[PDB]
Amino acid sequence: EIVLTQSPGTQSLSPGERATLSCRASQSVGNNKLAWYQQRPGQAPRLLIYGASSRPSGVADRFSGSGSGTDFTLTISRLEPEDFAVYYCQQYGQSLSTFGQGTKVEVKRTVAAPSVFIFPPSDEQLKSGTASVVCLLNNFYPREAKVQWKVDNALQSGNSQESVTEQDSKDSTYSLSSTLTLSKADYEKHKVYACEVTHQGLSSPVTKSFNRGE
Amino acid sequence: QVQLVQSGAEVKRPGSSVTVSCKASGGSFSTYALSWVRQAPGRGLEWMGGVIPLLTITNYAPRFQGRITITADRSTSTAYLELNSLRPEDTAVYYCAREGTTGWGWLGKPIGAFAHWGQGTLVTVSSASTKGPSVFPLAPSSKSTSGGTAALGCLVKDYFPEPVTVSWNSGALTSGVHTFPAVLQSSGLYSLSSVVTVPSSSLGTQTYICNVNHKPSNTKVDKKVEPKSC
């Protein structure tokens, strides 16, 4: 089974620059049957290059593929705004076809610190026996950010979930939402609830907190 | 131009079997390879198998070998994917894809690569029951910077299955809105947050209502978010 490995995982470049994506095969891809696909959020994948270098009609001229054997390359001569998406390579030279794990091409912009907000559980929710505390990390770059929950200055672990938005089309920033979930019982067992945010645009970890019932 | 239309979203329980259809319209059905590709939420593409209708030759991926069945019906120009013994990790969007060609008809020339894709079909496998979400307010802080920026929103909690759409003020408020991807809680229910940043000066005058829509449960909820009266 031929294993395709794409590199890098994430490619951070500014618009107008030249993007080069790599697809490495574990063994030789017969007859150069290697394809590149683009996929945007909420959409089906789109064929960009087939036969390692051939390009279907309707596909922009800035997309070109090259390589043979085990080393293939997708080249975007000039990165347009709509080019920032996920790209997959695919071999179909055997009956058993496989995809690469994919490469994300994101817009590189100036580092931006996250605006941090914290939300206590509403009185309506507490009425149902559970408590969800939401920490918001608004409009930041780069995507890598760390969120730590502190209940009475005690580091929490395994009781929170987070999700990140797609990179914004206007300011190219990211937003993160961390939700700490407790039972109303365990929520009333403590007083101080804090979310600690560590980022690169931050010289020191930012902490937003509240006291239960204030 | 070739058009692939798949069947609607499916909700199944563990151990059951689902059948997704892919009706082809346009071009030639019998001579071109029809494949099935799935994609788990936030994950990559995964080739499941393919078939050339006219040859009745099916090729499966080893991971699905034994629980998967792919068929092509030349009488209706429709391909089928059948996946048995469903488990929660089978939850994904299932795409149908056909190889592209240079020319029309049977004497068309195949390129192998997937040039044509269906709209995709969400198959959710869980023990959970279809449930509309509870919408709780993420109230604006009473410590909001006077003159600066305030954040508020709604917590769309405990629903099944995906998806949920959220808008603000019936589509009137779009600037600064962030609807986060849903996470699958340990209870088997989904949950997401939709926030928006607004001027702090508007907090006591402007009305903010999040419009939560959950088509799978026929639930539509409008929640008003206001500062808390502390």
Nearest by CB: A177 against B149, B157, B193: B193
List the Cα angle A26/A31/A32 in 5-degree steps. 60
CATH of domain B1-123: 2.60.40.10
Using a CB-CB cut-off of 8 Å, the residues of chain B touching A162 are: 183
Do A35 and B113 make contact, defined as CB atoms within 8 angstroms?
A: yes
DSSP string, chain A: -PPEEEE-SEEEE-TTSPEEEEEEESS--GGG-EEEEEE-TTS--EEEEBTTTB--TTS-TTEEEEEETTEEEEEESS--GGG-SEEEEEE-SSSS-EE---EEEEE----BPPEEEEEPPPHHHHTTTEEEEEEEEEEEBSS--EEEEEESS-B--SSEEEEEPPPPTTT--EEEEEEEEEEHHHHTT--EEEEEEE-SS-SS-EEEEEETT-
Q: What CATH number corresponds to the domain at position A5?
A: 2.60.40.10
Judgement on whether residues A65 and A114 belong to the same structural domain of the protein: no
Specify whether A71 is located in the same domain as A122: no
Domain, as residue range, for A118: 110-212
Boundary of a domain, candidates A109, A142, A163: A109
Contacts of B45 in chain A (CB under 8 A): 37, 39, 45, 88, 90, 99, 102
Q: Which residue of B has its CA nearest to A37?
A: B114
The number of domains in chain A is: 2
In the PDB record, what is the listed experimental method? Answer: X-ray
Six-digit token string for B184 = 């699958």
Closest CA to B94 of A23, A45, A74: A45
CA distance B24 to B57: 18
Resolution limit in angstroms? 2.7
Q: Are residues A135 and A38 in the same domain?
A: no
Same domain, A75 and A56: yes
Give the best residue of A38, A59, A92 to mutate against chain B (max B CB count within 10 A): A92
For the domain made up of B124-230, the CATH class stated in words is: mainly beta
Question: 3-class secondary structure for A8-66?
Answer: CCEEEECCCCCEEEEEEECCCCHHHCEEEEEECCCCCCEEEEECCCECCCCCCCCEEEE
Q: How many CB pairs under 8 A join A and B?
A: 132
Same domain assignment for residues A60 and A140: no
Collect all residues of chain B within an 8 Å Cβ-Cβ radius of residue A118.
Answer: 141
Question: Are residues A63 and A131 located together in one domain of the fold?
Answer: no
Nearest CA in chain B to A160: B185
Residues A56 and A157 in one domain: no
What is the domain partition of chain B in residue ranges?
1-123, 124-230
